[PDB]
Design a protein around this nucleic acid. Structure first.
Ligand SMILES: [Zn+2]
Length: 184
DNA sequence: GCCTTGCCGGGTAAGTTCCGGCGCG
DNA sequence: CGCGCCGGAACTTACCCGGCAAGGC
């Protein structure tokens, strides 16, 4: 179902970029499974991310609630759900097998979470070099030149720099086809 | 002349894992 | 009894930001 794979990919990019997949073991022997996306902007979390997550949930017949917790520095979209946790964890394990629909959606996701949002330059930051190397090939096989290097020597944070040469192709094909490549 | 890109410190917006509670068969 | 949802919240740091300078045509 192409539908959901795409939105799943996009959300997985947000999770990986701005959240987490958590398997907690409480004393009990209780457990919990969390799919998490955090972000400072209440409006982005309630009006764009939560509707997408809701759709996905409704469609996978997941009965958990979309929690939205107001932490001090951050809003936290949280779904407590074993089904949804593995849905994403398994999808992450098979990330190399993504198809062109998902890759674009995954990159858009990853970018909205981890990207340069001024769009003056096109940069994506992450400590997981392997993840970036994967995004790099998808970008290469899509006509978008890019390089990876260590940007933050202090915290081991790599950057994937997208060439301003392929600027338009990137913004127009991957971020959003209604977004103008060269910002104010 | 203009553009692109690697560097690198600032400091915040993310991330991670505790807790106490309740529900399910 | 043995697990899985809920609602938080403390605590840590991984991003992002943005200026600078080398270098490419
Ligand atoms: Zn972010």
């Amino acid at each position: 179902n192409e539908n959901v794979s795409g939105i799943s990919a996009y959300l997985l990019g947000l999770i990986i970029g701005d959240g987490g997949l958590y398997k907690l073991k409480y004393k009990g022997n209780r457990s919990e499974y969390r799919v998490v996306i955090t972000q400072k902007s209440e409006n982005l979390i309630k009006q764009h991310i939560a509707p997408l997550m809701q759709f996905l949930i409704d469609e996978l017949n997941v009965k958990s609630k979309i929690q939205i917790v107001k932490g001090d520095t951050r809003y936290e979209l949280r779904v407590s759900s074993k089904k949804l946790y593995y849905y994403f964890a398994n999808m992450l394990e098979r990330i190399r097998l993504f198809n062109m629909r998902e890759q674009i959606a995954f990159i858009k996701g990853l970018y909205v979470a981890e990207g340069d949002k001024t769009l003056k330059r096109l940069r994506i930051w992450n400590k997981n070099k392997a993840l970036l190397e994967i995004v790099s090939r998808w970008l290469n096989n899509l006509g978008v030149r890019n390089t990876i290097h260590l940007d933050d020597h202090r915290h081991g944070v790599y950057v994937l720099n997208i060439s301003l040469r392929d600027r338009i192709k990137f913004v127009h094909t991957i971020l959003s086809s209604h977004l103008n490549p060269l910002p104010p």
